[PDB]
Design a protein around this ligand. Structure first.
Ligand SMILES: *[C@@H]1O[C@H](CO)[C@@H](O[C@@H]2O[C@H](CO)[C@@H](O)[C@H](O)[C@H]2NC(C)=O)[C@H](O)[C@H]1NC(C)=O
Ligand SMILES: *[C@@H]1O[C@H](CO)[C@@H](O[C@@H]2O[C@H](CO)[C@@H](O)[C@H](O)[C@H]2NC(C)=O)[C@H](O)[C@H]1NC(C)=O
Ligand SMILES: *[C@@H]1O[C@H](CO)[C@@H](O[C@@H]2O[C@H](CO)[C@@H](O)[C@H](O)[C@H]2NC(C)=O)[C@H](O)[C@H]1NC(C)=O
Ligand SMILES: *[C@@H]1O[C@H](CO)[C@@H](O[C@@H]2O[C@H](CO)[C@@H](O)[C@H](O)[C@H]2NC(C)=O)[C@H](O)[C@H]1NC(C)=O
Ligand SMILES: *[C@@H]1O[C@H](CO)[C@@H](O)[C@H](O)[C@H]1NC(C)=O
Ligand SMILES: *[C@@H]1O[C@H](CO)[C@@H](O)[C@H](O)[C@H]1NC(C)=O
Ligand SMILES: *[C@@H]1O[C@H](CO)[C@@H](O)[C@H](O)[C@H]1NC(C)=O
Ligand SMILES: *[C@@H]1O[C@H](CO)[C@@H](O)[C@H](O)[C@H]1NC(C)=O
Ligand SMILES: *[C@@H]1O[C@H](CO)[C@@H](O)[C@H](O)[C@H]1NC(C)=O
Ligand SMILES: *[C@@H]1O[C@H](CO)[C@@H](O)[C@H](O)[C@H]1NC(C)=O
Ligand SMILES: *[C@@H]1O[C@H](CO)[C@@H](O)[C@H](O)[C@H]1NC(C)=O
Ligand SMILES: *[C@@H]1O[C@H](CO)[C@@H](O)[C@H](O)[C@H]1NC(C)=O
Ligand SMILES: [Ca+2]
Ligand SMILES: [Ca+2]
Ligand SMILES: [Ca+2]
Ligand SMILES: [Ca+2]
Ligand SMILES: [Zn+2]
Ligand SMILES: [Zn+2]
Ligand SMILES: [Zn+2]
Ligand SMILES: [Zn+2]
Ligand SMILES: [Zn+2]
Ligand SMILES: [Zn+2]
Ligand SMILES: [Zn+2]
Ligand SMILES: [Zn+2]
Ligand SMILES: [Zn+2]
Ligand SMILES: [Zn+2]
Ligand SMILES: [Zn+2]
Ligand SMILES: [Zn+2]
Lengths: 367, 367, 367, 367
């Protein structure tokens, strides 16, 4: 009676937006909480945006408050703008993860800048657990939904002061309580900003290598925490920044591998890849289907240019949990759309897209 | 246990407003979402306004945002003003239709400008289906409630680049999923802006001919999609624009037939007709009873001038679904009231009127 | 299972405020709906303010809208300020009455200025009945809660163009549907602004005589509509305007009998009387207990000066319906408190007071 | 089926913030209700801030209203800012107490300045009881949650015109109705601002001595109202103002004993103490663990500096009531954080911290 994915993932032949971002910019209404590190996650009924607040607007500018350095996590329904009257403060935190197990929300937040850093866990309204940095901190949560299968919830936690040598662990939770953890062998790479989905009792995640790779590393693991980390084997890297296309291999792409941005790869057969339109700008977003999976040479069948000119940012998976018509498990993603404002710089608003089995035209969503 | 109309339609001897529009103009409060292509539709408990947002007010003017060209459908309870805190974003879309089958909302939206145009369907929160333009697009939904009978939902979809030769289809849906469609034979006419109701297991609709008619074409069909299209046989055309009264016949009225505006005809015996007060202005709204039905010569018995001077616009049917006192099926309509503002031009607000069996005075609702 | 009063009314030895009015003036927040002809009425769970809107504030002034002459009834929870986000539009109307029968709300509104005047009735969300003026109009509802006993709801409806010769009827409703009505014999008086309560299967009401009396006429009737109209027999009139104390008798007090303001008398033994502090100003509010009932000579035992200086206005009864601790039926009243504003003249806000069996000090509620 | 504490209190090895205060200052949004004498209390599902309103913001300043001297109690969910749209007016009052017994809220408020002073009690929405000052008034409620065990609710009520000789009583309530009261023998001390928790069918409270003590007096009592009042036996006083450390004894600390501020002591073994960082300023907040209990010499094991520089104020206990994971009873506290504003002086916002059994780093929560 706890939640678990439907037995098979739906075929995906295209992606339709279920929500464009609230279309702010160059102006925006007062009383809006401005957000970063937002992601979406759903209960059995509807979906919510989870986010770190960093400011509140009024007259086109930021209210001078302490919101930027006193970081707290908030929640807002997907269908509502993020105002004070409509958003709820959940916990203090600078990064986070959240997921509904069918019964209650499990919410994790990290606080503290270095060795003082620690993670708190909430189950429903009740704080149920804590743990500390083990490798110098700061502890870092993914800013994407954690993954629940039949009452067990899994999240990737990062540690270490440098991308030089980060440490990453899978924590397994029940009732908001750590049952165990496994340290991953990630020698030679960096694996931040994990975004994940579940199917076939497995959990799959796409990382961001901020150290030495413009391709995105992939993690796959079971509920017993047996795992593998693999590299995409095409020659089209998907991080930003990145370099140009190279010949397909299983090697990392190290040209411009430094830095990066949260993003995802649908690790199925067919596999889908996603990235900005060009390598020179954070503009547009392109989804490409690879029939033979991400460990093939990468031959692209379908290719959708969902955004062409609009500046874009982080993206990640989320899964609908209470579908009643689909016999199969749907997959969706959230994506930051970036808008310039007149009075408070650049802002991020989430759009959401879901996979559908039926094909569709290459519509540009800029307008 | 799915919804179906009560067995007989209530006698209608007059129309009372159940909601005047929010009385904005020349001024209006900040944080209001300004709307177009609004209509109402109800669940088993209360009623909602569905609409395409095109702007957000502040200090009497439009916030410069991207709301106008990034079109999304929203929903607000009938009894509330359409503010950010109270309205919910449902789906991206430039035209739409919505209807509650007794269990969940079925919502359709159309997006794309020409051959890229396509329709998405939502059942509850779950996107359940899509289909594309077949005749060049854009696909166009009615902007009025779709019609559900015992779990099957019906809506009219228009296609084609010109009113010159539009194509129109009835789509039949279950669980937000297309079961079939039938193309209508509409050679020689144009049938947009369909607004519909159901009674006696039938569905009846009034169209707007934007090509060659100032009378409104009428569609009647069964759940097996057997249908007929008939022309009103009076000599008093009800579109706007239109020309003067002519001698009653079953011919179309082609004087000023070009263009038009969504509107309705209650296709019963007696039939009710509805139109602006005069042919020269979009002012007032007049409801006229024709005892012998719309295919008679049109002799008018009752005649109510609900608005005299106030500028008016689109209108359409909606049906209450959870009446518990009435033994019979009530019928209502929504109507745009147009208000001039000081700082953002002309706006539309919906009023709603319902039929009652008891007669009433010819009150003018301007004030 | 329909609602009915508890078998006996609680002893009342004093009155405590359960809500002061929102303390606006000289300033008030923007987005507030300004109200008149407000009263309170309760479901089985909590209580609501019902009111006619006449404006919306912004920057201390009235938004220039059409709200004043397009009158609509709204509802707001007692514990909330009356903003757009929190208030609900119910029906168009210039006067009204409302009452919950245990199952649904029955709501009546009157619209139209003279012979066109008519009343509409809502049961839950469903309009269930209408009737017209019979004596020239306008039809007038009390602006206080109607009274429901075991599924039958009663309200006083006034008619006629002059206080010179008004006509008053009791309408009996079930499911928002008129079952019958009885015209009262009110020759020689005027009986507007009825405010009522129920106990012992009876319904009792206090009127306002706008024609020839500064005492308040009292109506008492049964569910079979057998009734009596009696005059208070003290010499202390309670209308405003009024003249000074006179010697106790059953005669009307005609000095300054012209005009008046809605108000109440608790018609029990002991009886309670209520009025402004002095006859020269609408200031303060005084409640006086008369052990021998309102048809005695009026000897006053308890006397509470609840307000001394604050300007006050209309007042009326309401009854809590879902008490679970009290074995007896409580009685409360609402009272307008008048506040001067800097930018939109004088406003009215409701306070609510309830009777308690325990005595209490003569606290002044001005501050 | 009424609420009672879990059988044992959880071990507490540290304190984590479950909510930082809304980070206002130097600026804050309009439409905010500014509050004082706030505390938190929970139902079986979530938690609420209870508070006395004293103003409403707009454009960085206080709206000139009557809110400051017409004092009313309000309630807001912990996770929401305290705006008009989101806060609910409960009762008029200048001090208060509230507690959920598992079924309904019991709410007490005090009104009146001296001998007219009295207390009103609400059970759910129903006013159920009243009583008057017995020793000259004003009656004073604690401004912290009252305590419910199995349907009986207990609160400390203070009386008397001077801290010179205040009188304090325990009132026992059921269904919002006083069953009895016991006067405490508090000769030689003053015991205001009681903040309390329950465990082991006992109720424990920490007072504030505004007369002659910089240590905090402690009250412990049973449901039969057998009680004891004891003095902390360390030499580190916790009131503010206070003097420096002295040698441990059971004597009161009278240096700077005059005045004080609401605050708490966790009266267990180990005991926790809490106070500002230094004696010279109301800055920071420090929690210190005393393994041997508050009646020992006070040897400190753990010591957490939760705030260092930030100005702080009142603090008190609250208990979560609907935990489902913890087998034991959790304990939390609320704490005022003080922020300077540009346009309305100094404000107070509540943060909440809960005890956890796992240890944690000495993180500074200033930023
Ligand atoms: C931990 O993972 C690292 C990285 O994958 C493993 O090191 C690699 O081992 C293979 C041989 O099987 C080499 O071809 C790679 O070049 C190695 N990479 C580096 C940088 O060492 C390592 O073997 C794993 N350790 C354990 C204990 O299994
Ligand atoms: C499709 O509908 C059209 C329009 O009603 C039909 O054409 C009409 O047919 C009648 C004869 O029955 C003529 O009197 C009209 O003048 C025709 N209109 C035009 C412009 O052609 C047509 O027959 C229908 N087609 C089919 C296959 O049934
Ligand atoms: C209707 O009510 C009026 C007013 O009470 C009645 O008229 C009064 O009758 C009594 C005699 O019983 C006189 O003493 C009053 O002076 C009368 N008032 C006036 C102005 O007429 C009248 O009798 C009632 N009519 C009916 C049919 O019962
Ligand atoms: C009421 O409490 C007071 C204060 O605790 C008691 O007075 C104290 O009694 C002890 C002796 O047992 C003395 O050592 C203290 O110095 C006393 N304090 C003062 C100021 O009197 C008092 O005995 C209690 N009264 C009753 C009736 O029990
Ligand atoms: C906000 O306030 C602080 C002073 O209290 C200041 O450091 C900062 O510069 C202010 N922000 C702006 C934009 O002036
Ligand atoms: C869709 O509707 C049909 C109605 O016949 C119903 O039987 C079925 O449960 C619905 N689909 C699913 C799989 O829920
Ligand atoms: C809104 O912004 C864009 C520039 O970014 C501009 O094209 C448009 O004119 C602006 N609107 C107004 C009213 O100036
Ligand atoms: C109206 O009220 C009566 C009460 O006697 C009840 O029996 C009936 O169900 C109600 N009307 C309908 C048709 O629901
Ligand atoms: C409101 O608008 C109308 C003009 O459209 C005008 O008659 C009225 O004077 C205006 N109100 C004020 C206060 O100017
Ligand atoms: C008040 O509480 C008691 C608990 O013993 C309960 O029995 C009773 O039902 C409550 N009072 C009433 C009349 O509801
Ligand atoms: C608020 O209003 C009253 C006058 O009605 C005045 O006493 C007080 O000074 C005003 N407040 C301010 C800040 O001027
Ligand atoms: C935690 O989850 C387990 C699932 O196996 C469940 O049995 C248990 O009830 C939960 N914990 C508690 C004490 O509620
Ligand atoms: Ca990289
Ligand atoms: Ca036309
Ligand atoms: Ca009078
Ligand atoms: Ca002190
Ligand atoms: Zn920080
Ligand atoms: Zn946002
Ligand atoms: Zn290939
Ligand atoms: Zn567009
Ligand atoms: Zn609107
Ligand atoms: Zn005829
Ligand atoms: Zn009017
Ligand atoms: Zn108000
Ligand atoms: Zn007497
Ligand atoms: Zn006061
Ligand atoms: Zn606040
Ligand atoms: Zn020791």
């Amino acid at each position: 009676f706890y939640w678990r994915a439907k037995s098979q993932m739906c075929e995906v032949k295209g992606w339709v937006p279920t929500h464009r971002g609230f279309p702010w910019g160059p102006e925006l209404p007062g009383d809006l909480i401005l957000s970063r590190r937002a992601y979406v996650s759903c209960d059995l009924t509807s979906c919510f945006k989870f986010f770190i607040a960093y400011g509140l607007s009024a007259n086109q500018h930021l209210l001078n408050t302490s919101m930027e350095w006193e970081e707290s996590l908030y929640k807002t329904p997907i269908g509502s703008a993020s105002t004070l009257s409509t958003s709820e403060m959940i916990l203090p935190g600078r990064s986070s993860s959240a997921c509904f197990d069918g019964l209650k929300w499990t919410v994790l937040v990290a606080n503290g800048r270095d060795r003082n850093s620690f993670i708190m866990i909430k189950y429903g309204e009740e704080v149920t657990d804590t743990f500390s940095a083990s490798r110098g901190g700061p502890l870092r949560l993914p800013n994407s939904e954690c993954i629940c299968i039949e009452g067990s919830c899994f999240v990737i936690v990062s540690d270490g002061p440098n991308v030089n040598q980060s440490v990453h662990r899978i924590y397994e939770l029940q009732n908001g309580t750590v049952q165990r953890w496994k340290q991953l062998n990630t020698t030679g790479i960096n694996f931040e900003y994990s975004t994940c989905y579940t199917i076939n009792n497995l959990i799959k995640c796409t990382g961001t290598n901020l150290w030495n790779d413009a391709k995105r590393p992939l993690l796959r693991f079971t509920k017993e925490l047996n795992y593998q980390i693999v590299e995409p084997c095409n020659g089209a890297p998907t991080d930003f920044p990145r370099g140009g296309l190279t010949t397909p291999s299983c090697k990392m792409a190290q040209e411009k591998g430094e830095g990066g941005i949260q993003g995802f790869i649908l690790d199925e057969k067919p596999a889908w890849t996603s990235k900005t339109k060009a390598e020179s700008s954070q503009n547009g977003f392109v989804l490409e289907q690879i029939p033979n999976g991400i460990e093939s040479e990468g031959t692209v069948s379908l290719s959708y240019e969902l955004f062409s000119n609009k500046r874009t940012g982080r993206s990640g998976f989320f899964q609908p949990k209470g579908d009643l018509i689909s016999g199969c498990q749907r997959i969706c993603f959230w994506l930051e759309i970036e808008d310039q404002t007149v009075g408070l710089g650049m802002i991020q608003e989430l759009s959401t897209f879901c996979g559908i089995n039926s094909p569709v035209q290459n519509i540009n969503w800029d307008s």
